[PDB]
Fold this protein.
Amino acid sequence: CNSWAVAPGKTANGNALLLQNPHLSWTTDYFTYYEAHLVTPDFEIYGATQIGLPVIRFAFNQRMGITNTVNGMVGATNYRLTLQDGGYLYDGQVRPFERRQASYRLRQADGTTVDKPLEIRSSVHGPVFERADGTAVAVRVAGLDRPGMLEQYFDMITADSFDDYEAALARMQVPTFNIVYADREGTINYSFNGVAPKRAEGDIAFWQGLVPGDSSRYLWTETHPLDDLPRVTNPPGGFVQNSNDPPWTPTWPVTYTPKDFPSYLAPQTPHSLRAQQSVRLMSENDDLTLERFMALQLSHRAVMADRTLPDLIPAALIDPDPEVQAAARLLAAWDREFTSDSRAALLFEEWARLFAGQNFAGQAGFATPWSLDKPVSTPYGVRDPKAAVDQLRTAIANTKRKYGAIDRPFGDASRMILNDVNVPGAAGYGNLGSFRVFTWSDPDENGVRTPVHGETWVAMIEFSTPVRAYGLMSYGNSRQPGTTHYSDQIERVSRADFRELLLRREQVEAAVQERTPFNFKP
Amino acid sequence: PQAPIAAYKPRSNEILWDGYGVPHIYGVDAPSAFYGYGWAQARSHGDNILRLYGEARGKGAEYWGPDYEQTTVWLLTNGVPERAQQWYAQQSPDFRANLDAFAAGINAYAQQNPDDISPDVRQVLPVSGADVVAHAHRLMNFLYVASPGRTLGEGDPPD
């Protein structure tokens, strides 16, 4: 996911800008987004939300808007139990489980059901599961006493002011997510949100692993209020952002550092090249217009190539294999953009898969390591160029195996295909530096691949009066069999041709193609 | 201090759908708009919504068999369906009425357009305000925050 909010002072017209840009699976059902517009006499909300949710999580209106990104808030603990004498060891004593006899029905191949018993055991930590390898694990989830999740979102998105928004947010009923806010009065805000247990010791990695389940030492009971969490409001730099990076460069210059917060809230790991581009694209640009904001969102730079090709290319040209030399010259002539017509991009990805792992997040290959002191210009360089050239040799073979040649156009292999619509792809993997994201699948037998994850709902809003907003939904507004509204936006996505989002009654009345009167009686 | 444009004041309940299947739901009060929103989601995504609500009930195994069993065990063991009943009761009266209306919207869509609902998910209807709460509770707390994978040690790709 990406998120940007821009203060008035950083824009040409003097109105805040907001980007909504979540990245999730294109197929997982509960991750499907749906666009809609609700209007009553007392509120108005426009935007996207996961199907089945009755409130819009990615909302805006004439006054304000929010967006969300995944922050991985560590709101649960998995505890390793030590089993002993039919109970579990805890503070030097054996303690018996709570146990309940439940049951459920299981449908059989012939349409009937059988009754299946299900024992539910619990320790003081929580419900107990047995892993395949025999490890007994109790899971303890925070915020089970927070019934107001949906209402909190609803009050946040209909807030009459920033003060009303923050009081809603402060209820701590939404257990995770980074949340970014902007409004027509000029306020912008980033909050690292969620329900995080107060602990006395241990960093994030310790609390992400199996915590010992044999002691009250590690049994947390309380959680952090909103003002214990990383937040930024109207910073000197005039913007906030988050692209799933840890919350340590949400703006530039920064307003806090990792020492200001307990070490279990968020990782201190290298920021992804996409997250580095996010900071650069906002910080380096001033006097922003909506049009420019939208152009910057299409950024699809192979930043990883900028960090490696200067060392890789000369090293590869030393090699006696003429195919490696030719690969080197193909990469050297590349403008390092993930465009449809790029002949070098696929080959570059296959090299990066080896150099930085299959997820492209590996750090061991670089000469200069990542540092928070140079958060948007490290890591850099190739540590062992001879080894890297051997990786290129393998990647050449991999590229020909997968795609048929080392120089097949990126957009001929990378396609966006829904029903009978088939259009050329551009942009790519976030961890390679592409800001706009299409996480391409492994290729089929003809070398054709499509996005499994990436751009879904994409909207950009200027809080002028009236507001002006544009957006697209990659996979349409419907997935019901036979709908004409699954594949009808993807061609526009392939050209970055955004729809004007229509909030004013008069605009809606000009665009209407179907009218459903309804009436509700409780 | 320039004020925003005048808010529109709906005088009847209606969805104006645009050419891309985006619903513009106008309601004369909050419950009406939530009902309209439920109707719209059922038109656009009803099959998968019903399936997911079925699972958040803890009835995946019962409705659809062994492929849904592991999720059923995860959710019953973590007490999700019952906790959703509790959370529903714990709602503020005004917001509970919005939830009831959203559910009635789904039910009404299906009642009036039964041809649009896939056979395997018809057994899920009717849905309730509590079903809505339960799916949200599953999504936030037992997909996003606490995943079956991290607890059971099935630790591999993002999905």
